[PDB]
Design a protein around this ligand. Structure first.
Ligand SMILES: *[C@@H]1O[C@H](CO)[C@@H](O[C@@H]2O[C@H](CO)[C@@H](O[C@@H]3O[C@H](CO[C@H]4O[C@H](CO)[C@@H](O)[C@H](O)[C@@H]4O)[C@@H](O)[C@H](O)[C@@H]3O)[C@H](O)[C@H]2NC(C)=O)[C@H](O)[C@H]1NC(C)=O
Ligand SMILES: *[C@@H]1O[C@H](CO)[C@@H](O[C@@H]2O[C@H](CO)[C@@H](O)[C@H](O)[C@H]2NC(C)=O)[C@H](O[C@H]2O[C@H](C)[C@H](O)[C@H](O)[C@H]2O)[C@H]1NC(C)=O
Ligand SMILES: *[C@@H]1O[C@H](CO)[C@@H](O[C@@H]2O[C@H](CO)[C@@H](O)[C@H](O)[C@H]2NC(C)=O)[C@H](O)[C@H]1NC(C)=O
Ligand SMILES: *[C@@H]1O[C@H](CO)[C@@H](O)[C@H](O)[C@H]1NC(C)=O
Ligand SMILES: *[C@@H]1O[C@H](CO)[C@@H](O)[C@H](O)[C@H]1NC(C)=O
Length: 174
């Protein structure tokens, strides 16, 4: 059944600032041996053949759709990477999560700078409870956790607000 590679990102952040790094890794069931790989940036075949696709000092041109593919197996699901350039970027473990799975939010500051007085807003409303924590970690997700998020934080002496990010947790029917 698990008949297709699952692209994973390290760091998990599929949304990253211009110039940052990220490594795409193509992994699957060692059912059939894999000596090579096929990478696809915006549908075009990359020259990279190692199971790990690296992105150094991400450019905006690096944004897009990434997907790998091994021999004898279907094409991996797509993974969208998007390079930004702003003071605050709201990163997420996954923009879409199956109910029950972990959901991880983060208010990443430009050039890794530390962010103070961080507040997260879910649907224009301020997630007070989370005020204590720097970032938001939710072990077991809920369909109620769905909504448009965005953070607000002081970076190097000035206040800023990140671009909103819609996040949906799906209720699984079987
Ligand atoms: C792969 O497919 C992707 C589509 O899914 C392509 O992504 C687009 O790539 C272009 C550049 O190649 C990006 O454009 C740049 O955007 C920045 C950011 O602008 C921001 O700020 C202005 C004003 O301050 C605002 O008006 C904008 O809305 C942004 O908030 C500009 O500064 C650059 O000059 C340039 O226009 C696209 O943003 C990007 N789209 C996404 C969704 O990331 C990608 O290029 C494709 N690459 C290949 C190799 O096929
Ligand atoms: C790709 O994923 C599809 C499902 O969309 C798998 O299709 C099955 O393929 C077999 C013949 O290979 C066919 O008789 C079944 O009816 C298909 N099932 C469905 C639901 O359409 C396919 O996996 C299958 O084929 C490969 C070649 C291995 O033998 C797998 O063990 C087997 O499950 C997937 N293709 C590949 C190349 O993995
Ligand atoms: C992204 O990765 C590149 C690759 O290592 C980093 O560039 C290095 O920068 C250091 C300074 O910290 C230099 O000493 C090295 O020579 C650089 N290596 C290369 C290959 O250019 C870059 O700084 C990384 N950026 C982040 C945010 O991780
Ligand atoms: C709650 O989270 C743990 C993982 O730390 C997991 O074992 C458990 O199944 C989760 N609950 C649901 C409904 O998935
Ligand atoms: C963000 O959420 C709003 C309302 O839920 C929706 O209208 C908008 O299309 C979403 N953005 C994207 C890219 O789907």
């Amino acid at each position: 059944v698990p008949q297709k590679p699952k692209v994973s990102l390290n760091p998990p952040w599929n949304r990253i600032f211009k110039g940052e790094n990220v490594t795409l890794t193509c992994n699957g069931n060692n059912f059939f041996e894999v000596s090579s790989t096929k990478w696809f940036h915006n549908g075009s075949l990359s020259e990279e053949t190692n199971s790990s696709l690296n992105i150094v000092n991400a450019k905006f041109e690096d944004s897009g759709e990434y997907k790998c593919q091994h021999q004898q197996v279907n094409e991996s699901e797509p993974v969208y990477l998007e390079v930004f350039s702003d003071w605050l970027l709201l990163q997420a473990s996954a923009e879409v999560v199956m109910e029950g799975q972990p959901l991880f939010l983060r208010c990443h500051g430009w050039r890794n700078w530390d962010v103070y007085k961080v507040i997260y807003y879910k649907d224009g409303e301020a997630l007070k409870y989370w005020y204590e924590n720097h970032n938001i970690s939710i072990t077991n997700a809920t369909v109620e956790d769905s909504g448009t998020y965005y953070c607000t934080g002081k970076v190097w002496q000035l206040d800023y607000e990140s671009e909103p990010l819609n996040i949906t947790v799906i209720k699984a029917p079987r």
